[PDB]
Amino acid sequence: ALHRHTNYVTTSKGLTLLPKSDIKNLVLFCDEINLPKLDKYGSQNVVLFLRQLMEKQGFWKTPENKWVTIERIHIVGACNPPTDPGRIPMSERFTRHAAILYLGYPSGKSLSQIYEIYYKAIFKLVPEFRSYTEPFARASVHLYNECKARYSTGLQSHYLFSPRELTRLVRGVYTAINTGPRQTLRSLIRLWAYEAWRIFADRLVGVKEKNSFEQLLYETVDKYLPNQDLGNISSTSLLFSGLLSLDFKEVNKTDLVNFIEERFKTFCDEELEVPMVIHESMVDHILRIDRALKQVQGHMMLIGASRTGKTILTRFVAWLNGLKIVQPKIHRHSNLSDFDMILKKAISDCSLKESRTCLIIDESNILETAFLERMNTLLANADIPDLFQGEEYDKLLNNLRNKTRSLGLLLDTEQELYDWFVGEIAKNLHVVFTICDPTNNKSSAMISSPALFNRCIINWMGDWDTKTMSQVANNMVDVIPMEFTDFIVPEVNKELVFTEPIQTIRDAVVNILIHFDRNFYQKMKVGVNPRSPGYFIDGLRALVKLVTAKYQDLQENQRFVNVGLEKLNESVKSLTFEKERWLNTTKQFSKTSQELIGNCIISSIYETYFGHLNERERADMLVILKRLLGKFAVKYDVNYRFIDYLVTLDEKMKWLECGLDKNDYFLENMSIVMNSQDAVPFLLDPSSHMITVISNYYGNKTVLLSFLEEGFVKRLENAIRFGSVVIIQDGEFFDPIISRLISREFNHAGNRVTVEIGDHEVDVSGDFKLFIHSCDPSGDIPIFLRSRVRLVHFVTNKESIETRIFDITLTEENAEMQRKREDLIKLNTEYKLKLKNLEKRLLEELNNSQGNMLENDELMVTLNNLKKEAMNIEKKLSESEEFFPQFDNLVEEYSIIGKHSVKIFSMLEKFGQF
Amino acid sequence: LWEDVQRTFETPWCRVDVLLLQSDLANFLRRADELPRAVKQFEMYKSLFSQVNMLTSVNKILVELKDGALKPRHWNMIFRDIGKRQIQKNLLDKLEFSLKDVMVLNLTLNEILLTKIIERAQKEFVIEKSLNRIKKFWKEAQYEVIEHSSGLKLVREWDVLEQACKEDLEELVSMKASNYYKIFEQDCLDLESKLTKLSEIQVNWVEVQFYWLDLYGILGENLDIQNFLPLETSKFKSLTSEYKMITTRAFQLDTTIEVIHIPNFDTTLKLTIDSLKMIKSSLSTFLERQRRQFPRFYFLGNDDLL
Numbered sequence A: 001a002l003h004r005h006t007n008y009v010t011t012s013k014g015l016t017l018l019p020k021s022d023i024k025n026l027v028l029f030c031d032e033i034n035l036p037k038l039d040k041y042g043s044q045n046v047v048l049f050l051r052q053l054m055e056k057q058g059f060w061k062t063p064e065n066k067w068v069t070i071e072r073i074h075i076v077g078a079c080n081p082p083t084d085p086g087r088i089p090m091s092e093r094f095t096r097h098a099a100i101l102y103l104g105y106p107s108g109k110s111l112s113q114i115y116e117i118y119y120k121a122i123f124k125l126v127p128e129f130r131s132y133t134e135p136f137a138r139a140s141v142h143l144y145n146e147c148k149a150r151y152s153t154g155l156q157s158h159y160l161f162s163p164r165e166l167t168r169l170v171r172g173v174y175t176a177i178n179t180g181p182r183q184t185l186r187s188l189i190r191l192w193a194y195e196a197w198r199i200f201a202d203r204l205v206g207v208k209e210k211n212s213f214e215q216l217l218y219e220t221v222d223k224y225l226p227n228q229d230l231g232n233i234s235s236t237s238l239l240f241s242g243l244l245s246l247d248f249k250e251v252n253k254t255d256l257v258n259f260i261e262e263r264f265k266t267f268c269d270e271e272l273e274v275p276m277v278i279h280e281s282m283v284d285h286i287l288r289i290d291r292a293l294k295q296v297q298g299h300m301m302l303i304g305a306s307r308t309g310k311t312i313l314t315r316f317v318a319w320l321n322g323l324k325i326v327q328p329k330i331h332r333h334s335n336l337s338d339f340d341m342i343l344k345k346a347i348s349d350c351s352l353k354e355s356r357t358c359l360i361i362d363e364s365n366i367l368e369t370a371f372l373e374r375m376n377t378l379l380a381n382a383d384i385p386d387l388f389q390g391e392e393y394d395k396l397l398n399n400l401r402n403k404t405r406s407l408g409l410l411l412d413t414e415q416e417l418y419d420w421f422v423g424e425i426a427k428n429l430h431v432v433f434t435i436c437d438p439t440n441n442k443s444s445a446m447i448s449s450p451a452l453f454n455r456c457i458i459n460w461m462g463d464w465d466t467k468t469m470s471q472v473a474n475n476m477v478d479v480i481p482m483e484f485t486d487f488i489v490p491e492v493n494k495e496l497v498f499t500e501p502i503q504t505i506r507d508a509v510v511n512i513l514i515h516f517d518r519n520f521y522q523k524m525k526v527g528v529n530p531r532s533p534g535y536f537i538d539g540l541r542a543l544v545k546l547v548t549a550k551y552q553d554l555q556e557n558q559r560f561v562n563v564g565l566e567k568l569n570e571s572v573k574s575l576t577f578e579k580e581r582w583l584n585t586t587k588q589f590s591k592t593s594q595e596l597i598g599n600c601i602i603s604s605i606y607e608t609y610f611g612h613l614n615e616r617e618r619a620d621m622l623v624i625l626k627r628l629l630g631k632f633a634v635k636y637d638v639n640y641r642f643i644d645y646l647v648t649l650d651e652k653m654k655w656l657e658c659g660l661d662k663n664d665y666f667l668e669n670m671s672i673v674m675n676s677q678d679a680v681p682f683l684l685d686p687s688s689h690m691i692t693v694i695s696n697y698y699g700n701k702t703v704l705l706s707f708l709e710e711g712f713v714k715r716l717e718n719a720i721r722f723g724s725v726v727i728i729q730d731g732e733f734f735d736p737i738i739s740r741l742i743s744r745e746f747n748h749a750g751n752r753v754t755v756e757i758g759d760h761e762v763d764v765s766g767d768f769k770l771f772i773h774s775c776d777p778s779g780d781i782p783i784f785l786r787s788r789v790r791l792v793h794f795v796t797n798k799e800s801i802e803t804r805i806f807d808i809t810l811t812e813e814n815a816e817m818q819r820k821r822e823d824l825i826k827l828n829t830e831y832k833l834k835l836k837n838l839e840k841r842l843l844e845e846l847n848n849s850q851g852n853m854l855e856n857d858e859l860m861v862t863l864n865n866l867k868k869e870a871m872n873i874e875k876k877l878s879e880s881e882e883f884f885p886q887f888d889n890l891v892e893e894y895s896i897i898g899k900h901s902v903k904i905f906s907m908l909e910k911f912g913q914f
Numbered sequence B: 001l002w003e004d005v006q007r008t009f010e011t012p013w014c015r016v017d018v019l020l021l022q023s024d025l026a027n028f029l030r031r032a033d034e035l036p037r038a039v040k041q042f043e044m045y046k047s048l049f050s051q052v053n054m055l056t057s058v059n060k061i062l063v064e065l066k067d068g069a070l071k072p073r074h075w076n077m078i079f080r081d082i083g084k085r086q087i088q089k090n091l092l093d094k095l096e097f098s099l100k101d102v103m104v105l106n107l108t109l110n111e112i113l114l115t116k117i118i119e120r121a122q123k124e125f126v127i128e129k130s131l132n133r134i135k136k137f138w139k140e141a142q143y144e145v146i147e148h149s150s151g152l153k154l155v156r157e158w159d160v161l162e163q164a165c166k167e168d169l170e171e172l173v174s175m176k177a178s179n180y181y182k183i184f185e186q187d188c189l190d191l192e193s194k195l196t197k198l199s200e201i202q203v204n205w206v207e208v209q210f211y212w213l214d215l216y217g218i219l220g221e222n223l224d225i226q227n228f229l230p231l232e233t234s235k236f237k238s239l240t241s242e243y244k245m246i247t248t249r250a251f252q253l254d255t256t257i258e259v260i261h262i263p264n265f266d267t268t269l270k271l272t273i274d275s276l277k278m279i280k281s282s283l284s285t286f287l288e289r290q291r292r293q294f295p296r297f298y299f300l301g302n303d304d305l306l
């Protein structure tokens, strides 16, 4: 930092000095002087360097070992009180040399005058309300005071208020008045309220504190600006934006939503394609991000939860304002030099070319504290001196000197050139941090950092509320047909319903999905929910595709049965009149079509949520989902089995042949892995027995990689270009270069689909699958990966004992009952296949028996045959009607046995752990 | 205008540019109406306007078939399966057919089969681009040469080319998984064969060069040690002479890959490395025989003992 303003010199008695470059004295303002961390032995070296500079008046060059005597350079530091969090105490050996001055807040009453001067300044644009300069200021000050007392650090660690908030509010009020239309008192009050919302209540967490701030705003307005014409001051009730008009005026909600939709469609088309749904919170946050990006040093920190839309929302808002989006393409083996080069390129584009970039820094786009320090230096100042120093400085000053000449402005001094450079960076570079969970150590360090927290506008997206989920679901379940279930409006409590009052099956579906998501997060997740619905969206998409597929299947089966019935009516033998009876399945179709939506909901929820659950958690949450379906008026197959419903016999035999176990848990896990291929599957298993199984499924096409080997980055680029299944042996590690592959975010063209990996664009064959595989369940995965990927647990938990001993007990306690249990379902399934087989046999035989007589003997004998399987089907159904009650009665006894067995095994495993 | 539009219809497809074609079609549309009614009543104006509207009706098709992925094989398939005719090979292989043929193919209707064949065209070009990149890289690769005290030439930076050869071999292996590999098999197989031979020569060469450097410090410099081991140094001098001739003839080629065509190169390097390993074993046995006579030499090592 000193290299720009200091000039090393040499003298015989004056071995190298480091004085001013100019003739003016130099004052080193070291802000946050007590912030740097201290070594493990308890000594922070930067403070000792400062003491050396103030006591010894010099230091030692580390390459050359020469005493450098600083000349007429003064040291002025600034520090928060040591009692503040993160403030390391300073040694008395350093502060012994410095005069300490305490600067408190300006008494709380002087703030009134200090900002009344600002309001008198900014009301020169609107003289008609000159007399309102004094009220506003007091109100503003009062607001600040209240927000300082209500929202303390005890609630949230980022609830730090200061007069800087008041200055931001005054600048916002001016920059809305300056570019706004002719104003009225109601308009000014609403404008001030909007700016107050954006300054004080953006960082607030939870609806309770937002409502508290809203009532505080109402009280302040009624106390200091007792106007009589005002609307609702709620966050979504007032919307100020210059996207529609050329001014900055409060816009109607409907026009804003229509414009946002018609622009978002174009953005999804011409830019990267991500099918997305527009809702009210999206519009509000688009306005917030637009306001932040519009100002000069507009940096934002979006603290929400994964899969909320923050990154793509920032990209959309940048595209609206014509900002070049730059995202650091870093990976696991990316060091500080790569980040420095990326920042250098971004700065060069920002200043030497006036590119107006928008650097989106994710939480995971920083790996060590050096990246965060680079962000601090870039944000606190408007430049990073460490990038441009030494000879690289000499080039920069050259590139400035040419460039500043091309703008028609003359600047020959180095200081003037660098000041123009800093100003261009400040007014052209916007940094938008996006962090998923703020309780993580990296994200907590990002938030608590002084430069970021003081320069960035903390916008707390938070997780989706029930209104946003209802809007998204309504816009997502409006594509699939539901004109066959014959829904009847059910009687439910007003608290249970989330969307508009239930009048159709679609509202019931969205209510069930929202309620199950809430219950699932209530059971699995504890305390606060830093997880935004990615399960909800994936479940909605799965339900869409599954309803479509199941209704197509039902249509095909109905068509087959109807054409068979027409043929039998056409066939005019003696026994076909009884196949008129056995074609009563047209009556069964009416019952099985009513339960289609319920079965599809259960199967989609099972595919999405239960991938990473135990054998008992799956049962409990399935019971919860069934009681939720029963709470509303949607029906489902009472004896529903996921394996039977989704996977067919052929696929199950293929999986068993490939090497999969006989467990129902493993069959369900494999069904989840294979059936759901809209998202990458993440197979977790301690034994690697699945890695071979998948390979056995894909023969010679399987390619095994890992995130540890050096050539992996290239090898995938081959497998991704020639269509070979990829299994990555490690998943706990993850280099974000595969990021654009984890989320299906491709660059389409005429007929070639292209994906960006690192900085290479590679063509996707279309035969390429990706399975991520992990071994240790103890290992963690990045929040970006975990919420995008279909996590499937292949572990053999303790609860696997609970069922397994049953299969032993019933084997050696009721041998006949165990024998009938398996063959009941086995014969049932093979009957549902072979009766259809015989029906199409009969149909094609009738096709071949149009007018012959000798051929009818085979028709008659097969007609008599089909009666046998009809009797067996009826007998099996009648026997099951009594077997299932007895089976469920018999389950509970051996469940009692297993309750003790699992505890015994847990004690044994704790013994083994010791 | 009729002469101009007839001339623009006869330009070879290998030279047609859509950017100027748009302006030319705009001019044709502008100048169609200004023709007198004598042209309008005749078939000349009607045919001209119909052909101009045919050209302007499809413009995505023209730019898609202007892509580099298209090849004479694809043009032959398009002509045979859509145009129902055969194109002269000289007219086809150079893509010099006129725009009238493109009109004949009727891009408006057969666009579904057109896109079906173009998709295959881009995937085959995905394979061909990797093949061309590998060939271009290995037609310009060369070692980095230095000269030490002796007249021998030494290679530096083995990795920058060894890793490239290994990665290219892995790429050529992985190309077999692609469905559209059959047409490119006859070239990929030969390229893989050449790269395997080059990789074997590289593996022998790095070891030969390393062992020769290691032994040059021991033998060939100190006269005393060569006197104690006359057979070893006598063999070493002949090895150095043969290696010098081999390396001079090898770097007289300006390309790394062409060493696979040098007569008796890989076997020569195998013999050289075998003889160097035998000389190293002889040194080890001599040093151990010296140490077993005065065992305190076990506290010194090899360089000190030498």
Ligand SMILES: Nc1ncnc2c1ncn2[C@@H]1O[C@H](COP(=O)(O)OP(=O)(O)O)[C@@H](O)[C@H]1O
Pocket: A274, A275, A276, A277, A278, A279, A282, A305, A306, A307, A308, A309, A310, A311, A312, A313, A434, A472, A537, A743
């Ligand atoms: N309104 C919405 N409609 C549909 N999907 C959405 C919506 N908002 C977010 N999503 C889902 O959440 C993801 C958000 O993407 P992105 O913003 O890039 O990641 P992050 O939210 O973690 O920053 C998208 O993949 C999208 O599928």
